[PDB]
Amino acid sequence: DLIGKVKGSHSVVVLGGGPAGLCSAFELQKAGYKVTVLEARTRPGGRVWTARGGSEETDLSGETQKCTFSEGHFYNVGATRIPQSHITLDYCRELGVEIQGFGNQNANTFVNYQSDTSLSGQSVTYRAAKADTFGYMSELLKKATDQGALDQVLSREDKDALSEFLSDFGDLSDDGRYLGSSRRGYDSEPGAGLNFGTEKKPFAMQEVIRSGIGRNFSFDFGYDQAMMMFTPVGGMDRIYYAFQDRIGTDNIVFGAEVTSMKNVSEGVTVEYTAGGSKKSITADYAICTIPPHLVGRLQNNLPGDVLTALKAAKPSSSGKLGIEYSRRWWETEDRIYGGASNTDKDISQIMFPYDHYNSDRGVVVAYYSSGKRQEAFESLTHRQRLAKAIAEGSEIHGEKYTRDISSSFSGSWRRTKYSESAWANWAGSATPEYEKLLEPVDKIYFAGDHLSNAIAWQHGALTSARDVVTHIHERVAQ
Amino acid sequence: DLIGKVKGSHSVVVLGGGPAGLCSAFELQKAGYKVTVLEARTRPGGRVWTARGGSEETDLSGETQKCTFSEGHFYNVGATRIPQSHITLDYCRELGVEIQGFGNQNANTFVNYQSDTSLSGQSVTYRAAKADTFGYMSELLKKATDQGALDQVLSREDKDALSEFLSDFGDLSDDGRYLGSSRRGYDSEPGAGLNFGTEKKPFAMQEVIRSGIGRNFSFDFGYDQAMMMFTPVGGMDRIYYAFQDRIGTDNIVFGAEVTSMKNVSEGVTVEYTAGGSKKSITADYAICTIPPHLVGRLQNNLPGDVLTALKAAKPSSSGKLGIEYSRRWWETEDRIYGGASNTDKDISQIMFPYDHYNSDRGVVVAYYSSGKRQEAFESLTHRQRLAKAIAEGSEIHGEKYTRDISSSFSGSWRRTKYSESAWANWAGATPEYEKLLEPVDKIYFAGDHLSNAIAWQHGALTSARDVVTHIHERVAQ
Numbered sequence A: 001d002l003i004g005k006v007k008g009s010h011s012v013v014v015l016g017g018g019p020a021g022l023c024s025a026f027e028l029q030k031a032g033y034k035v036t037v038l039e040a041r042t043r044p045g046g047r048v049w050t051a052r053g054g055s056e057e058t059d060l061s062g063e064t065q066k067c068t069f070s071e072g073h074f075y076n077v078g079a080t081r082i083p084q085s086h087i088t089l090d091y092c093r094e095l096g097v098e099i100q101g102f103g104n105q106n107a108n109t110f111v112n113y114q115s116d117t118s119l120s121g122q123s124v125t126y127r128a129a130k131a132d133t134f135g136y137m138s139e140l141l142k143k144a145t146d147q148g149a150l151d152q153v154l155s156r157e158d159k160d161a162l163s164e165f166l167s168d169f170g171d172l173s174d175d176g177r178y179l180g181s182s183r184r185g186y187d188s189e190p191g192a193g194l195n196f197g198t199e200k201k202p203f204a205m206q207e208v209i210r211s212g213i214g215r216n217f218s219f220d221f222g223y224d225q226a227m228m229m230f231t232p233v234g235g236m237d238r239i240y241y242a243f244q245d246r247i248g249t250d251n252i253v254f255g256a257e258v259t260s261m262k263n264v265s266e267g268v269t270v271e272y273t274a275g276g277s278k279k280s281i282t283a284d285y286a287i288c289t290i291p292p293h294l295v296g297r298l299q300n301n302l303p304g305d306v307l308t309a310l311k312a313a314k315p316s317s318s319g320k321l322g323i324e325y326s327r328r329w330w331e332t333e334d335r336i337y338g339g340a341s342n343t344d345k346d347i348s349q350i351m352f353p354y355d356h357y358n359s360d361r362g363v364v365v366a367y368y369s370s371g372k373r374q375e376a377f378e379s380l381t382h383r384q385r386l387a388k389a390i391a392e393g394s395e396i397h398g399e400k401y402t403r404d405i406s407s408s409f410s411g412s413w414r415r416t417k418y419s420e421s422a423w424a425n426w427a428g429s430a431t432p433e434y435e436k437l438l439e440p441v442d443k444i445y446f447a448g449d450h451l452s453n454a455i456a457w458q459h460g461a462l463t464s465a466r467d468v469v470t471h472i473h474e475r476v477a478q
Numbered sequence B: 001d002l003i004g005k006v007k008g009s010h011s012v013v014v015l016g017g018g019p020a021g022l023c024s025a026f027e028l029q030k031a032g033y034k035v036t037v038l039e040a041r042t043r044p045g046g047r048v049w050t051a052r053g054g055s056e057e058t059d060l061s062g063e064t065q066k067c068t069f070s071e072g073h074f075y076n077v078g079a080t081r082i083p084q085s086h087i088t089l090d091y092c093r094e095l096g097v098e099i100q101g102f103g104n105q106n107a108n109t110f111v112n113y114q115s116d117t118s119l120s121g122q123s124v125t126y127r128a129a130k131a132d133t134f135g136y137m138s139e140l141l142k143k144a145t146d147q148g149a150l151d152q153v154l155s156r157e158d159k160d161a162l163s164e165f166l167s168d169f170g171d172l173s174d175d176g177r178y179l180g181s182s183r184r185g186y187d188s189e190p191g192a193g194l195n196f197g198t199e200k201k202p203f204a205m206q207e208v209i210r211s212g213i214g215r216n217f218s219f220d221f222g223y224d225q226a227m228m229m230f231t232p233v234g235g236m237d238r239i240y241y242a243f244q245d246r247i248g249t250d251n252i253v254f255g256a257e258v259t260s261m262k263n264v265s266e267g268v269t270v271e272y273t274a275g276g277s278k279k280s281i282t283a284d285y286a287i288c289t290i291p292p293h294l295v296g297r298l299q300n301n302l303p304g305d306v307l308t309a310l311k312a313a314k315p316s317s318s319g320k321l322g323i324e325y326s327r328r329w330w331e332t333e334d335r336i337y338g339g340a341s342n343t344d345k346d347i348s349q350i351m352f353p354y355d356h357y358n359s360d361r362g363v364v365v366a367y368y369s370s371g372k373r374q375e376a377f378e379s380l381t382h383r384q385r386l387a388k389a390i391a392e393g394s395e396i397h398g399e400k401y402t403r404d405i406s407s408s409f410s411g412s413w414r415r416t417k418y419s420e421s422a423w424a425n426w427a428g429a430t431p432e433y434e435k436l437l438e439p440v441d442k443i444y445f446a447g448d449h450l451s452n453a454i455a456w457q458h459g460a461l462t463s464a465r466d467v468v469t470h471i472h473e474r475v476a477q
C-alpha cells in the first residue's frame, strides 16, 4: 500500500537498524528493492530496548550491567507506551505483534510533592487528590457564578447549566460546598450487611491549593498520553524483532559500526567495521538513521551547511531503572495494578507493571526521569542509582519499597553507546536546520524521529521512514 | 483464611450457584463442612453470564436465541468490570483466573447528546469535549480569580497557585484564555517532515455549556469505575467455572430448580426438580441466594414479616446486545481500542472490546442500558432490538456501523430466567434490608442485594463470607 512495485534492479543501504531503519528496509523490500541494513548493536530496535534476563550492556563510563530478571519479566528501557493514533499500532497489526493495554492512568497510585503545607512530601492517591482539587475548584467557580462575577459572559441559562455540571463534577453538597466524596476512596472498604465502610476525609481548601497536588493531572490529557494506551505483550522490542524476521537476518549486518558515508559516482559508499574487519558497501541510495549528533563523527563528504544543521538537533538526557521484587506488594497492600506514582523528587515517577497481574513477582520501574532529574543519575554507578531510587521511592510508598528486592537494571540514554541521547531538541523550536535536513544530499537521505513532528515517539521514526522511502521510490520511478 | 476448621459433622445446602452461593460453598468446604449447591441453570455464575458461540437462551417471552460468535469471541451479558478494591480480584488470584485491563475510559470514543444547539446529535470525541469543557471552566475561574471575586476566601499566594494550575489544567494562552489545544486531537495526524498535522478547532463557550457535552465526565471518578479497571481474560464467568472446579461437580446439582425451602426439626429441607424428577435434600443450615423477589414463589414457612421484607427489594431492568463484526472498523477507522461511547439515546452506550486488538473481527456491545432506556428494548424481539441498536449506533458511529455484521445476541435481565432483575432497588440500610440480614432459624439469606455494593460481585462475595462466618460461629456455640 505505501508504494508500488519497483521496475528493475535498485539498491539501498540503511545505516541504523532502529525503528526508522528497519521500517525503511521493510517497505523497500516489499516494493522490490535490494536493501542492506547496517546496525552497530547486536539487537534490532535502537532506543526501543527491552531489558530481560541475559541482557548485558557496557555504558560509556565502562560499567557493565548484567540483567538477571526472572523468565517472562522485563521492562522497556526506552519506548514503552503507544497512543491509539500512532502508526506503530498499524505496524503491530501488519507484523502480528500482539498488544495489550498500558496503564497510563490510575486512581490508586500516589502523588507526592514538596510544598509549604502539611501535605509536603505526603503521598496522596490520585482519586483523593482529584476529588479534593475538583471539589474545591467546582465550589469556587460556583461561588463566583452565584456572586455574579461571570454575568457579562454567561446567560442565566448558562449559569444554571454550569452550576449543575459543577455540582456533579465536584460532588458538591446541595448548598454548593465540597465536604468530601466517596470518590476519595475509603479507609475501610464497603462490604455486606451493616459494614458501610468509612470514607477518607478531605483536606482543607487552602492546603489543597497550596500543596500543588493537582500539578500533574493535565498529563491525563496529553494527546499522545491519554487513555486508552497500549504496548506489545512481552516487550516493545518485539515489534523490531518482528521487523528483523520479515526483512531477514541475511539483509541485516549486526555488529556493524559505520565509520564512513560518502556520495560517490555510483550512489553511496558506506565503510563499516564488522567482525574486526573493514568492510565497504555501495548502493544506489542510502537512508541514514544514525542519531544526528553522531553523524558528524563519521567520515563524510556532506556539505558544510548540512553538517551545521545536524548540530542543531541537541541531545537530551533520559533514563530508567527497574527493580524485580519477589512480592507484588503494590497489588497486595496498596491495591495498585499498573499506573505510575508521580513526584517532584529526582526519581520523577514510579511505574508499576501492566502484566502478570496477581502473580508472585514483578518489575517496577523505580525511576523514569529526564532533563535535570536524569542528570542526577547519569554519573552515578548502577549501585548508587539503585540506592537513590530505593531511598526516594521509600519516601513515597513506605518501607515495603525496600523489601523483597531480587535484582535491578538501569539505562541512561546519554551514557549509552550508539545513542548518546534519549531524543533531539532542535535549537530555536519547523526550524531551518530541521527543514534543511529533509532534503536529500544527492543520494543520501536522512530519516529518524528527530525529523518528525513526533520526536521521542516511534510514530515519528516510522512516518519519517515511510516519507523517505516514498521519496526514493518517486525518484526511481522518475 | 476465612474461618478455622469445623469440628464434627455439619452440613449446609446452598440455593443458587451464582457468586454468593459458589463463594459460600467454597469457603464452607475449605473449613470441612458438607456442602451441596443447587443451581437452576445449566451453568454456574448467575448474573455473571458470558455469551459465546453455542450459547442458547430462551427468555420469559419464549423467544430462543442461539449465539453464533466466532471461536474465542464473547461478551459479558452481566458483570464485566472490576475495580481494584473489590475482593473479586482476591478471588481471581486464589482461583488462578487471569485478569487483564478493562478499558473504562477512552479519549477517542464519542459523546453524542441532544440539545438546543448545533451540537445536537453530533459525535464529539471525549478528548475534544474534555479539552473544551476544562479549557473554558479554567478560563472562567481564572477570570473570576483575577477580577478579585474570590479575595475573601483566597490569599494572593492562593490565587497565584490556583492560577498556575488553571493555565495548565485548561491549556490556557499566556493571557488566560482558552483558544483550543492539541489535547482536542487532530484532523490530520502529525507525521514527519513538514507534515505538521491539523489541530481540531474548539467549540465556543456557549455551545459547550448549552450542549451539556460534559455531563458524563464525572463517571470517570466513580469509586467503583475509575481506572484502572480489570476483567478476567476470556470472560467473567471464568471466575465461577473456577469456583465450580474447586468445589467439585459432585457437590453441585445443575438444572436443579428449587421449589420448596422449609425449616424442619432435622434442619432445613429443600425440594427441587432436576431432569424432570422430584428430589429432596436436608441439611443442618441453608444459605439462600435466590433473588429476593423470587423467594416468595417457593413453598416455605418463612414468617409473614420476612415475606414482606423480601418484597421490598424491587427488581430493576438492564440489558445488553452484542454484535460481532467481520471487520474491526472502530480500531481501523475511528482509532478506538476499547472503551465506550456515551449517549442520551436508548442504547445509552456502545462498548468496544478489550481483547483481540488488531484482529480481523470482534464483538461490540451495541447497547448496555438500564431503567427507562432498557424498558425500551425489553419487550422487543431480538430482531427488533438489533434493528433499533443499529439505527441508533449508526447515528453515533456512522454508516459503517450497519456493515460487516456477522451475528448478534442480546439479553434483558428482567425477562430472563431465574434472574428476572438486574439487581435490587430497595424501597425507600432500610428496615427490610436490615431484617433480612438475620437468620430465619436455620435459613440465611445472602446475595449482592444484602450488601453496600449491590450490582457488584464484591457485594455477593462479601455477603457470602459474612454468612459463612455467622454459621461457623453458631456451630462453635
Ligand SMILES: Cc1cc2nc3c(=O)[nH]c(=O)nc-3n(C[C@H](O)[C@H](O)[C@H](O)COP(=O)(O)OP(=O)(O)OC[C@H]3O[C@@H](n4cnc5c(N)ncnc54)[C@H](O)[C@@H]3O)c2cc1C
Pocket (backbone or CB within 6 Å): A015, A016, A017, A018, A019, A020, A021, A038, A039, A040, A041, A044, A045, A046, A047, A048, A077, A078, A079, A080, A081, A082, A088, A256, A257, A258, A259, A289, A290, A291, A294, A318, A319, A413, A418, A419, A421, A422, A423, A447, A448, A449, A450, A455, A456, A457, A458, A459, A460, A461
Ligand atoms: C527514555 C525513552 C522513552 C521513550 N518512550 C517512548 C514511548 O513510550 N513510545 C514511543 O513510541 N516512543 C518512545 N521513545 C522513542 C522511540 O524509542 C524512538 O522514537 C525510536 O527509537 C527512534 O527511532 P530511530 O530509528 O529514529 O532512532 P534509534 O532508535 O536511535 O535508532 C538508531 C540506530 O542507529 C544505530 N547506530 C548508531 N550509530 C551507528 C553506527 N555508527 N553504525 C551503525 N549503526 C549505528 C543505533 O544502534 C540504533 O539502532 C522513547 C525513547 C526513549 C529513549
Ligand SMILES: Cc1cc2nc3c(=O)[nH]c(=O)nc-3n(C[C@H](O)[C@H](O)[C@H](O)COP(=O)(O)OP(=O)(O)OC[C@H]3O[C@@H](n4cnc5c(N)ncnc54)[C@H](O)[C@@H]3O)c2cc1C
Pocket (backbone or CB within 6 Å): B015, B016, B017, B018, B019, B020, B021, B038, B039, B040, B041, B044, B045, B046, B047, B048, B077, B078, B079, B080, B081, B082, B088, B256, B257, B258, B259, B289, B290, B291, B294, B318, B319, B413, B417, B418, B419, B421, B422, B423, B446, B447, B448, B449, B454, B455, B456, B457, B458, B459, B460
Ligand atoms: C447488567 C448487569 C451488569 C453488571 N455489571 C457488573 C460488573 O461490571 N462488575 C461486577 O462485579 N458485577 C456486576 N454485575 C453484578 C453481578 O453480576 C452480581 O453482583 C452477582 O451476580 C450477584 O451474585 P448473587 O449470587 O448474589 O446473585 P445471582 O448472580 O443472581 O445468582 C443467583 C443464582 O440463583 C439461581 N436461582 C434462581 N432461582 C433458583 C431456583 N429456584 N432454584 C435454584 N437456583 C435458583 C440463579 O440461576 C443464579 O445462578 C452486573 C449485573 C448485571 C445483571
Ligand SMILES: Nc1ccccc1C(=O)O
Pocket (backbone or CB within 6 Å): A080, A081, A456, A457
Ligand atoms: N515519549 C515520551 C516523550 C517525553 C516524555 C515521556 C515519554 C514517554 O512516552 O515515555
Ligand SMILES: Nc1ccccc1C(=O)O
Pocket (backbone or CB within 6 Å): B080, B081, B454, B455, B456
Ligand atoms: N455494576 C453496575 C452497576 C450499575 C451500573 C453499572 C454497572 C457496571 O459495572 O456495568
